[PDB]
Structure 1
Amino acid sequence: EVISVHSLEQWTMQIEEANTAKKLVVIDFTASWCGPSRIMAPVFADLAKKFPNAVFLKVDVDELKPIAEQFSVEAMPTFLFMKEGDVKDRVVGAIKEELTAKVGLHAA
């Protein structure tokens, strides 16, 4: 359920797609060298199932920095909540409970 984005072109496709389906998009901006970021992977992977009607994308900031500098993302991990092109809210850090919570409020 967690789709990793590997190119700027792939990113645009995923966003446009989810938009046509009027779905909620949750995005995890990661770093493989960042301890706090790895820890949140399972928590993100699990919530990926907890809500199938939302789209979960994984973006490595070392690979697609332009996407991070576009949404003002300077810390990792950072979870972004989007819908129809506009950001609705974001969670900064490995704050599990604040994640597992803000997801229900925007998804359901």
Structure 2
Amino acid sequence: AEVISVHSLEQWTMQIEEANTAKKLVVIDFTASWCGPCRIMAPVFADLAKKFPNAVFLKVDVDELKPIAEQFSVEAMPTFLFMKEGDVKDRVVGAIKEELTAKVGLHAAAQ
């Protein structure tokens, strides 16, 4: 499985609605190109996506898709947001590899 980069509101809408229909966890990496910690977490996030094919891993550039960043009050990067069927389940703020890994394991399992 791969990380899906979302570059438009249309793409966001399509990914979220398809995930919601399939009732699967969505994990969103809110990122910025200039942000150092974001570069550090890119491989960690991509690795987790391969390890958890039942969940959808999305990448959102906060400068590219401002309404989506604003929707979730994202002003710190990287922010990893966990969402299932319209509800925010968790958030990880910063380059915390252990916390991100643990929370993906917690939320991606059968509920």
Q: Normalising by structure 1, report the TM-score.
A: 0.97
CA displacement at 1:2 relative to structure 2: 0.4
What is the distance in 2 between the residues matched to 1:94 and 1:65? 21
How many pairs does the alignment contain?
108
What is the distance in 2 between the residues matched to 1:93 and 1:65? 19
Q: Runs of 5+ in structure 2 lacking a partner? A: none
1:39-63 per-position Cα deviation (integer Å, ceiling 9, x unaligned): 0000000000110000000001110
Q: Runs of 5+ in structure 1 lacking a partner? A: none
What is the distance in 2 between the residues matched to 1:48 and 1:10? 18
SS in structure 1 opposite 2:28?
strand
CA displacement at 1:9 relative to structure 2: 1.3
CA displacement at 1:65 relative to structure 2: 1.1
Identity of aligned residues (%): 98
CA displacement at 1:88 relative to structure 2: 0.4
RMSD: 1.1
Consecutive aligned runs of 4 or more in structure 1 exceeding 3 Å deviation: none
